[PDB]
Structure formats: structure tokens, C-alpha cells
Chains A and B, each alone.
With several copies, the nearest count.
Chain A
């Protein structure tokens, strides 16, 4: 590891600087180095890891979608053949995206999930595992796709089971997990009714628990509830 010679605290400090500078590839490399020190991550450090890789893979996903759309138009009837370049470059970006997802999944497997005993950490990491298998599923097309989809579903389901037993229905990790599992159902698993049902039940159970929250917690929970509502508006 190229970060093996840097102090854990220095890696965390530099991840925060990289976030401020919008240098998300650097941020992800610093947080990978911090994970590889072998100690568990605090709440703040888990957030830094998630922010870093979310931004890296988010740029890759946006680029892959642009290139996939160009490629699909090139394969429509009446399109003049442009050679292999669109496919090759889409494949290049796709392979890079898959590499980032595999890197994240490898960190979760070695050994973040197995050492995560508290609900807040274990649910966070299992949600991440579902998310990065979902990003793999977005580009999967072989006999690969069904197994990747099942891996995403399995991680999300384990996270859901823990979150329902151990967290209040307004907990932002629980809410973001349910949001992302509903997106999995709608966009990946061809299960829009399950997506709508999960988003509705999640929203309603959180609404009924808002009265227990402080002003700051209320703001955190309602932000994610609004995304559930925004999706329900798009889906219904």
C-alpha cells in the first residue's frame, strides 16, 4: 500500500482536506489507507470513506451513462457504423468503475464488516455493500447479472433486518438504507411495487417517530424522508 508509511491520523486529516478541495480520488485513496491500518472506523471516519467513494463512483456512473447512451444510439437502425471506439471507451470506463466497486467491496470484506458489532457500524457497512453491488448491477449484462443482483439484495436485506431490530425508524442510516433498497427494487430488480411499498411504509413509520426528535435530529431525518417522497412522486 502506497499509504502504508503515513500515520492513520494524517490520512484522516488529509482525507478531510481533499474533501474541501473536491479531490475525491485522493480522498478515497487516503481513506483506503486509513482502513488498511486495521483499526475500526469511527462514525465520522465511516462518513469520510462513504463520501469519498460515492463521489468517485458517481462520476464514473455519470460518464458510463453518457457513453452507454451514445453506444445505444450507434446501434439503432440507420446509424452509420463508427467503428469500435464507442464500445471500447465505454468498456474502459466500465472496467474502471467495476474496479472501484471491487476495491470498496474488498475493504468491507477485509475486514470492516466482520469487526462491526454495533448496529450503527454494521448497518452502515452492509448498506455500502448493497450499494456497491447495486452499482455493479447497473452495468452487468452476462450470466453475472443475476448473481450480482442477489448479492446486493442479500446485503440490503441483512442491513434491513438489523436496522428494524436495533434502530428507531427515524435513524438517518436506517432511512438512507431503506431509500437505497427501494431504489434497488425499482431500478435493478424490476420490482416497482416493492419499491413503492417500502418507500411508503418507511416514510409513514418515520413520520410517526418525528415527535421524539430534537430540532437537529428532526432536520436530519426529514431530509431523507423528502427523498422517499420525491421518489414516490416520480414512481406514482
Chain B
């Protein structure tokens, strides 16, 4: 799955 923005 694609990577999304972290904290």
C-alpha cells in the first residue's frame, strides 16, 4: 500500500 504523511 502507498505511504501517506507521518506525524
Q: Do any beta carbons of A and B sit within 8 angstroms of each other in the complex?
A: yes
Residue-by-residue, is A170-182 near B (CB-CB < 8 Å gives 1, otherwise 0)?
A: 0000011101101
Total number of B residues with any Cβ neighbor in A under 8 Å? 7
- Chain A, residue nearest B5 (CB): A176
User: Is B7 within 8 A of A50, CB to CB?
Assistant: yes
Please measure, in the bound complex, the distance between the C-alpha atom of A183 and the C-alpha atom of B2, giving whole angstroms: 6
Q: Which residues of A contact B3 (CB under 8 A)?
A: 179, 183, 227, 230-231
Interface-centre pick from B2, B3, B6, B7 (highest chain A CB count, 10 A): B2
User: Is A180 within 8 A of B4, CB to CB?
Assistant: yes
User: Is B5 within 8 A of A227, CB to CB?
Assistant: yes
How many contacting A-B pairs (Cβ < 8 A)? 30
User: Is B2 within 8 A of A54, CB to CB?
Assistant: no
Please measure, in the bound complex, the distance between the C-alpha atom of A215 and the C-alpha atom of B5, giving whole angstroms: 21
Please measure, in the bound complex, the distance between the C-alpha atom of A54 and the C-alpha atom of B6, giving whole angstroms: 9
Q: How far is the CB of A120 from chain B (nearest CB, A)?
A: 15
Q: How far is the CB of B7 from chain A (nearest CB, A)?
A: 4
Please measure, in the bound complex, the distance between the C-alpha atom of A131 and the C-alpha atom of B1, giving whole angstroms: 16
A234 at the interface (CB under 8 A from B): yes
Please measure, in the bound complex, the distance between the C-alpha atom of A230 and the C-alpha atom of B1, giving whole angstroms: 11
Residue-by-residue, is A23-59 near B (CB-CB < 8 Å gives 1, otherwise 0)?
A: 0000000000000000000000001001100100000
- Chain B, residue nearest A131 (CB): B4
Q: Which residues of A contact B1 (CB under 8 A)?
A: 187
Q: Which residues of B contact A235 (CB under 8 A)?
A: 2
Q: How far is the CB of A13 from chain B (nearest CB, A)?
A: 19
Task: Show 17 A/B contacts (Cβ-Cβ < 8 Å), sorted by A.
Answer: A47-B7, A54-B7, A175-B5, A176-B5, A179-B3, A179-B4, A179-B5, A180-B4, A182-B2, A183-B2, A183-B4, A186-B2, A224-B5, A227-B4, A227-B5, A230-B3, A231-B3
**Chain B interface (Cβ within 8 Å of chain A)?**
1-7
Contacts A175-B5, A176-B5, A179-B5 known; list 15 others, CB within 8 Å: A47-B7, A50-B7, A51-B7, A179-B4, A182-B2, A183-B2, A183-B3, A183-B4, A187-B2, A227-B4, A227-B5, A227-B6, A230-B3, A231-B2, A231-B3
